[PDB]
Design a protein around this ligand. Structure first.
Ligand SMILES: Nc1ncnc2c1ncn2[C@@H]1O[C@H](COP(=O)(O)OP(=O)(O)OP(=O)(O)O)[C@@H](O)[C@H]1O
Ligand SMILES: [Zn+2]
Lengths: 660, 304
DNA sequence: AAAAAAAAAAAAAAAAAAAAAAAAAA
DNA sequence: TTTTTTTTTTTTTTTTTTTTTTTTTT
C-alpha cells in the first residue's frame, strides 16, 4: 500500500498511466472516500453527508463537489483531477456511489450510477484563448447558448455479432464522439460481418449545443468565436436557447476528413464534453458566492428561515432591506417587495383562470433613483429580463417566427417575456416607446399567455411574468395641480392593468436635502475600494452590510425563492363587507373627481397584496393584519395621485377604513 | 394486510398519505412529515415514480417483495404496527377486496349518495334514503355501486384531511380545564358536516392525532359545526383513546362516555332550545344563540 | 479468371413569407 | 410630431437512386 506522501512521486513519465496503475487506484479511492466522509467546515458539520441525505430524498442522480474543499485538503488529488479528468471521474463516481449506499441501502433499484458535478474551478478561460496545451484537461468556459439539437437515445454498451463464427463480442464503452471500430475476431480469426446485436442494450440521453462568445467578453468590433458542447444524461434540457451559461468540461480533439480536405493541412476538430452547468442570465452577483445555484437552500438554511419567519415585524425588516443604500421612498420599496413575493394564481372548476402577479409603475421626476431600484430588482430576482425604450420591438418582447437552418420548417423562438416566465421583466423609459411595441404586452399582462398565428403555426404560449415599469411625466416633471390623465400619455386600457402606481415628486426642503446629502456622502465613503485572509475578507464585507441591512442579501435571496416555491396561502376567513365598502367608495370617488381608472380589476389587487403579505410571513393563511395593510397600501396609492385641491378632503374621507 | 387507506384501489403513496395512523406517527400535515415520508420511500428502495402508480399496474417485482421491505424498514420510523392479518374475498376473474375497504365503501355510500323544521326533515329524509343505496351494495350483482362508493370514500377522506390541516395550523383547539373545545364557524364545505358520520370522521382524525402526541391527557373533546341554512350548531362529544400500540396493562372496559347525562342535566334545568333526538345521545342540535352560554354551564356541570 | 464491395452522378433556384430599418406625410 | 407609408434583405444546398462502370480479393 501507498500513502498520501507517496503519491507525490510519479513514474511512467505520464500522469494518466500513474493514476491508472492498480496500486495507485486503491489509495486514490480510499483517500477520496475519507474526504467524502470526514470533511467538516468551520461550524463542524459534515456537508457531503447532508448532500447525500438530500440526494436520496430528491431521487437525484448527481452529486456536487466543490473544488476548493478538495484543494484545501488533499491538494495532490486536486492537481490530479485538474490535469487528468477522465480517469479520476470514473473512480470518483464509484466511490460516490459507495458512500451513497451507506445512507440508502438498496438504492441501486432507483439509480444504478451516481454522477459527480465539479464546482468552482479556479481558472476561467474564454473561447478565444483556448490552445492545444489545454487538450485533455478540465476547463471552465463562459458563453451564450445559440442552438440545441434535441434529445436522442445513444448506445452505452455496444455489442457485435459475427455470423460465420456466430461470435458475440464483449460490451464496448462508446466514446460518445467516435464510432466504435472493431474488425478482429477472438474466435472467427478473420474479417466477418458485424451486427448491432438488436435489442438487449442500454441507452443514454444525448444532446448537442453550440456556445458563442458573450457580447460583453468580445472586444468591441471583433467577430465572435464558437464551440460545440456535448450534454449527456441528467444534463439534457438544462440550458435553453438564448440564455448565457458557464460550462465546466473536458477539451478534446478528433480527426475529421472534411477539415483536412478543405484547409489542406492535417488539422483536427475540437469539442467539449460538458461536466457542470451554471446559469448566469441576469446575475451580477457572480463576483462572489459558491456553488452551481445560489438560489438553492440546505436543511439548516430552511430551519433558519422558519426560525426568523416567526419574529414579529418580519415584514418591516424585509421592506427595510430592499435597496438599503437608497434613502427614503418607502412606498416604492413596499411595492417592490410585494411584486417580488407575488400572489397566488387560481383556477375555479377548470374553466375560469385568475392571474396572481402584481405589476408596478413608477412615474417620477428625474434624478430620484428609479433606474437603480430597477437594477436592484434585476439583481435580486431569480429570473429577470431588462429592456429600455426604443431598443425593444414587438417580437423582441414576444415570440418570433424563424426558418430553422437544419429542418427548414417555420419554428417559434423565444423573447423577453418568455425568457422571464415565472420571473420579472423590467422596462426602463416606458413612455419613450412606440405604441405598436407597447401594445404587444396587453395579452401578457392580464391573460398571462401569448398567441401566434403565422405561416401555418397556430399556437398559444405561456408567460407568467410580472412587470415593473419606470416612466417620465409630460414635460419631464409632474404638475401637482393637474389630474393624472393629463400628466401621462397612456390611456385607460394599459393603466388599468397596473396594480400599484408610485408618483415620485421632488420638492424643495432644507432638512430633507441635508439628510439626503449626508446619507449619499456616507454611502460614497463606505463604498470606497481602499486565520485565512479569504475569510477576513468575508468578515470585513459583512461588517459593512451590518449597518444598512437588517438581514444579509444572500440569505434574503434564498428566503424569497423558498417563499415563492413552497407557500400558497388562502383566504378562508376575512371581512367581505370592508372590502366591498372600500371598492364602492373608490369607484364613487373616481368619476366624481378623479382620473385614475377603477374597475373590478382593482378589487382583486387588494386580495393579491394580502396574499403577498401572508407569503412574507411564511404563513399558510391570510390574517386581518395583512388585509388591512393591503387596503391601506391601495388607498394611499390612490389618494396621492390627486390634485392638491381635493387631496385633503379625499384623505379625510378615506381615513376611517385605515384606523390602525 | 396493512393499516392503509384503500391500498388495492389507489397508489401506495396515497395509502401512506391519507392514513390516520401514519399521519399521527409522522405529522404529515406540515412539510416535515412529507419530507420524512419521502426519505422513508427513498430508503425502502421504491422509486417515487413507481410508488405513485395504480396497484394493478404497479411493478410485479416490487409487489412480490413488499412484505420483506415493510418488515426490515418500518421499525426505524415507528410504523411497525401497520402490519396485520385480515380477510380477502375474491369472485372469479374480477379482483380481490378486503373487509376494511368494503366497510369504508359502505360508510361513504351512507354519508353522501343519491321554516327550519322542513329543512331538517328533508335532510333526515335523504339520510333515510341513503340506507337503501348502502343496502344494494351488499349484493354481488351491483358492483358499480361499490366502485362509486370507493370513489366517494376517496373524495371524503381528502376533504377531511383538508379541513384537519386547517384546524391544526390555526390552533383552533382550545384547551379548557375539563374538556377541549373545537368550533368550526367559518371555512369552505361546512355542508358536509351536517351528517353525524362526517363529523365522527373528523373527530376520529383529531383524536388519533392527539393520542400519539407526547402530551399525556385523557380529556374528552367537543366538536361543533354550524349550518347557515338552519342557523343551528350540531355538537358532538368524543371520548379519548389510548395509543393503538400501547400495552394491555391499562386495558379494561374502555373510557366511558358521560356526555349524555351532562346534556340531560343541563337541558332539564334550563329552557335551552336544544334538540336531543338522535339515537346517539352524544350528538345534539343547539340553536346559534344558546351555544356560548350552554357551554359555560357545561364547564360547571362536571362528570367530564 | 472469377466473386464481392464501393462509390460517382447530383443540381438549383425562383417564389413567398416575416422582420427592421431608412424616407414619406394629417 | 407621430403617425402612416416604403425598400429590402437573407431566407436557399444534406440529399438519390439503382444501373453502369471500376478496383480489390478469394
Ligand atoms: N435617495 C436618492 N434619491 C435619488 N438618487 C439617489 C439617491 N441616493 C443615491 N442616488 C443617486 O442619484 C443618481 C440618480 O439616479 P438615477 O440615475 O437612477 O435617476 P433617474 O432619473 O431615476 O434615472 P433614469 O432616467 O435612468 O430612469 C444615481 O447615481 C443614484 O445612485
Ligand atoms: Zn467472426
Amino acid at each position: 500500500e501507498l500513502t498520501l506522501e507517496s503519491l507525490s512521486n510519479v513514474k511512467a513519465n505520464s500522469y494518466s498511466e500513474w493514476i491508472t496503475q492498480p496500486n495507485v487506484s486503491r489509495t486514490i479511492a480510499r483517500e477520496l472516500k475519507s474526504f467524502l466522509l470526514e470533511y467538516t467546515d468551520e461550524t463542524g458539520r459534515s456537508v457531503y453527508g447532508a448532500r447525500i441525505r438530500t440526494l436520496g430524498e430528491m431521487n437525484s442522480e448527481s452529486l456536487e463537489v466543490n473544488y476548493r474543499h478538495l484543494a484545501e485538503s488533499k491538494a495532490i488529488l486536486a492537481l490530479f483531477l485538474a490535469k487528468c479528468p477522465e480517469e479520476m471521474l470514473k473512480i470518483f463516481d464509484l466511490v460516490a456511489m459507495e458512500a451513497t449506499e451507506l445512507h440508502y441501502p438498496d438504492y441501486a433499484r432507483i439509480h444504478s450510477e451516481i454522477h459527480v458535478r465539479i464546482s468552482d474551478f479556479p481558472t476561467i478561460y474564454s473561447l478565444r484563448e483556448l490552445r492545444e496545451s489545454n487538450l485533455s484537461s478540465l476547463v471552465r468556459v463562459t458563453g451564450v447558448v445559440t442552438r440545441r439539437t434535441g434529445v436522442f437515445p445513444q448506445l452505452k454498451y455496444v455489442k457485435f455479432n459475427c455470423l460465420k463464427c456466430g461470435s458475440i463480442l464483449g460490451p464496448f464503452f462508446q466514446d460518445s464522439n467516435e464510432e466504435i471500430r472493431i474488425s478482429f475476431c477472438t474466435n472467427c480469426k478473420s474479417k466477418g460481418p458485424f451486427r448491432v446485436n438488436g435489442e438487449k442494450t442500454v441507452y443514454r440521453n444525448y444532446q448537442r449545443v453550440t456556445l458563442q462568445e458573450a457580447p460583453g467578453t468580445v472586444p468591441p468590433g471583433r467577430l465572435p468565436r464558437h464551440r460545440e458542447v456535448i450534454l449527456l444524461a441528467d444534463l439534457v434540457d438544462v440550458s435553453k436557447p438564448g440564455e448565457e451559461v458557464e460550462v465546466t468540461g473536458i477539451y478534446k480533439n478528433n480527426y475529421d476528413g472534411n477539415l483536412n480536405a478543405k484547409n489542406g493541412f492535417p488539422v483536427f476538430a475540437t469539442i467539449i464534453e460538458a461536466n457542470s452547468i451554471k446559469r448566469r442570465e441576469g446575475n451580477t452577483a457572480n463576483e462572489g458566492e459558491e456553488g452551481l445555484d445560489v438560489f438553492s437552500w440546505t436543511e439548516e438554511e430552511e430551519r433558519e428561515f422558519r426560525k426568523i419567519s416567526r419574529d414579529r415585524g418580519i415584514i418591516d425588516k424585509i421592506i427595510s432591506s430592499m435597496a438599503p443604500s437608497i434613502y427614503g421612498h418607502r412606498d416604492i420599496k413596499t411595492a417592490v417587495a410585494c411584486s417580488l413575493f407575488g400572489g397566488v394564481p387560481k383556477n375555479v372548476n377548470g374553466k375560469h383562470s385568475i392571474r396572481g402577479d402584481i405589476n408596478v409603475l413608477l412615474l417620477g421626476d428625474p434624478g430620484t433613483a428609479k433606474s437603480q431600484i430597477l437594477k436592484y430588482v434585476e439583481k435580486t430576482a431569480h429570473r429577470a429580463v431588462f429592456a429600455t425604450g426604443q431598443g425593444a420591438s414587438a417580437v423582441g418582447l414576444t415570440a418570433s417566427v424563424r426558418k430553422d437552418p437544419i429542418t427548414k420548417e417555420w419554428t417559434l423562438e423565444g423573447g423577453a417575456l418568455v425568457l422571464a416566465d415565472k420571473g420579472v421583466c423590467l422596462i426602463d423609459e416606458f413612455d419613450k416607446m412606440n405604441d405598436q411595441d407597447r401594445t404587444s404586452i396587453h395579452e401578457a399582462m392580464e391573460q398571462q399567455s401569448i398567441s401566434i398565428s403565422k405561416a401555418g403555426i397556430v399556437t398559444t404560449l405561456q408567460a407568467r411574468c410580472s412587470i415593473i415599469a419606470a416612466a417620465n411625466p409630460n414635460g419631464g416633471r409632474y404638475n401637482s395641480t393637474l389630474p393624472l390623465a393629463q400628466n401621462v400619455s397612456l390611456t385607460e386600457p394599459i393603466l388599468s392593468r397596473f396594480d400599484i402606481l408610485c408618483v415620485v415628486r421632488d420638492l424643495v426642503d432644507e432638512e430633507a436635502d441635508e439628510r439626503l446629502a449626508t446619507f449619499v456622502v456616507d454611502s460614497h465613503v463606505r463604498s470606497h475600494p481602499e486565520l485565512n485572509a479569504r475569510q477576513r475578507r468575508l468578515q470585513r464585507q459583512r461588517k459593512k452590510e451590518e449597518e444598512i441591512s437588517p438581514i444579509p442579501q444572500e440569505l434574503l435571496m434564498k428566503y424569497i425563492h423558498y417563499a415563492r416555491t413552497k407557500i400558497y396561502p388562502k383566504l378562508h376567513q376575512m371581512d367581505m363587507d370592508k372590502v366591498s365598502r372600500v371598492y364602492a367608495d373608490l369607484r364613487r370617488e373616481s368619476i366624481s373627481t378623479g382620473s385614475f381608472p377603477i374597475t373590478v380589476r382593482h378589487l382583486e389587487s387588494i386580495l393579491r397584496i394580502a396574499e403577498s403579505f401572508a407569503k412574507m410571513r411564511l404563513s399558510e393563511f391570510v390574517s386581518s393584519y395583512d388585509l388591512d395593510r393591503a387596503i391601506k397600501v391601495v388607498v394611499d396609492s390612490f389618494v396621492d395621485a390627486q390634485k392638491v385641491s381635493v387631496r385633503r378632503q379625499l384623505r379625510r374621507s378615506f381615513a376611517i377604513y385605515t384606523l390602525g | 394486510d396493512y393499516y392503509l387507506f384503500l391500498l388495492r384501489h389507489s397508489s401506495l403513496y396515497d395509502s401512506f398519505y391519507y392514513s390516520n395512523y401514519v399521519n399521527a406517527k409522522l405529522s404529515l400535515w406540515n412539510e416535515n412529515g412529507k419530507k420524512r415520508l419521502h426519505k422513508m420511500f427513498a430508503r425502502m428502495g421504491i422509486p417515487l415514480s413507481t410508488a405513485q402508480e395504480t396497484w394493478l399496474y404497479m411493478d410485479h417485482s416490487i409487489k412480490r417483495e413488499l412484505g420483506i421491505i415493510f418488515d426490515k424498514n418500518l421499525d426505524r420510523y415507528g410504523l411497525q404496527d401497520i402490519i396485520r392479518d385480515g380477510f380477502v374475498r375474491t369472485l372469479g376473474y374480477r379482483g380481490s377486496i378486503s373487509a376494511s375497504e368494503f366497510v369504508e365503501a359502505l360508510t361513504a355510500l351512507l354519508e353522501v349518495g343519491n321554516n327550519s323544521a322542513q329543512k331538517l326533515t328533508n335532510l333526515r329524509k335523504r339520510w333515510v334514503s341513503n340506507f337503501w343505496l348502502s343496502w344494494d351494495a351488499l349484493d354481488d350483482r351491483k358492483v358499480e355501486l361499490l366502485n362509486r362508493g370507493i370513489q366517494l370514500a376517496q373524495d371524503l377522506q381528502r376533504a377531511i384531511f383538508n379541513t384537519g390541516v386547517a384546524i391544526l395550523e390555526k390552533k383552533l383547539i382550545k384547551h379548557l380545564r375539563i374538556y377541549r373545545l373545537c368550533v368550526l364557524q367559518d371555512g369552505p364545505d361546512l355542508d358536509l358536516y351536517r351528517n353525524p358520520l362526517t363529523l365522527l370522521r373528523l373527530g376520529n382524525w383529531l383524536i388519533e392525532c392527539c393520542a400519539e402526541s407526547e402530551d399525556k391527557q385523557l380529556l374528552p373533546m367537543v366538536l361543533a359545526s354550524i349550518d347557515e341554512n338552519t342557523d343551528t350548531y350540531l355538537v358532538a362529544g368524543l371520548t379519548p383513546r389510548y395509543p393503538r400500540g400501547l400495552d394491555t396493562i391499562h386495558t379494561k372496559k374502555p373510557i366511558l362516555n358521560n356526555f349524555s347525562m351532562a346534556f340531560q342535566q343541563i337541558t332539564a334545568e334550563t329552557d335551552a332550545k336544544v334538540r336531543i333526538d338522535n339515537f346517539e345521545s352524544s350528538i345534539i342540535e343547539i340553536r346559534r344563540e344558546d351555544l356560548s352560554p350552554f357551554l359555560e354551564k357545561l364547564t360547571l356541570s362536571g362528570l367530564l
